C-alpha cells in the first residue's frame, strides 16, 4: 500500500486559458459579472440606519 | 505385564495415526483458507488503483 504514481490533470478550457471570448472584431456588447462581495474592500460601517 | 504393555503400545500407535489423520484434514481446510485470502489480496491490490 502507498506505492503509487500521481498523474496531474488540469482544467483546460476557454476560461482557464483566458480571454473569455477573444472578441477581435469588437462592436459586441458583453455581459457584466455579479456583485462579487469579496472584491469590494471599502471602508466598513456597522451603521445600518434602517 | 509384557502383554499389557504390548497391547497398550498398539493402541497408542493407532491413536497417533488417528491424530495424524485429523491434522491432515485440518491442514487441507487451512490451505484453502490461504488460497482464498491470496485471491482477496489480489483483488484488493487491483482495487487500490484510482
What method was applied to determine this entry? cryo-EM
CA triplet A19, A9, A18: central angle to 5 degrees?
A: 5
User: What is the secondary structure of chain A as a DSSP string?
Assistant: ------------SHHHHS-SS---S-----------TTT-----------
- Distance of CA B14 to CAs B4, B23, B28, Å? 16, 14, 22
- Chain B residues within 8 A of A1 when measuring between CB atoms: 48
Hey, which residues 2-41 in chain A have their CB within 8 Å of chain B? 4
- Asked if B5 is an interface residue toward chain A (Cβ–Cβ < 8 A), one would say no
C-alpha grid cell, residue A18: 483566458
Amino acid at each position: 500500500d502507498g506505492q503509487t504514481i500521481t498523474i496531474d490533470l488540469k482544467k483546460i478550457d476557454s476560461d482557464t486559458l483566458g480571454l473569455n471570448g477573444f472578441n477581435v472584431n469588437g462592436k459586441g456588447e458583453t455581459a457584466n459579472t455579479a456583485a462579487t462581495l469579496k472584491d469590494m474592500s471599502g471602508f466598513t460601517a456597522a451603521a445600518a440606519p434602517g | 505385564r509384557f502383554t499389557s504393555n504390548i497391547k497398550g503400545l498398539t493402541q497408542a500407535a493407532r491413536n497417533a495415526n488417528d491424530g495424524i489423520s485429523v491434522a491432515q484434514t485440518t491442514e487441507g481446510a487451512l490451505s484453502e483458507i490461504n488460497n482464498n485470502l491470496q485471491r482477496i489480496r489480489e483483488l484488493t491490490v487491483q482495487a487500490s488503483t484510482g
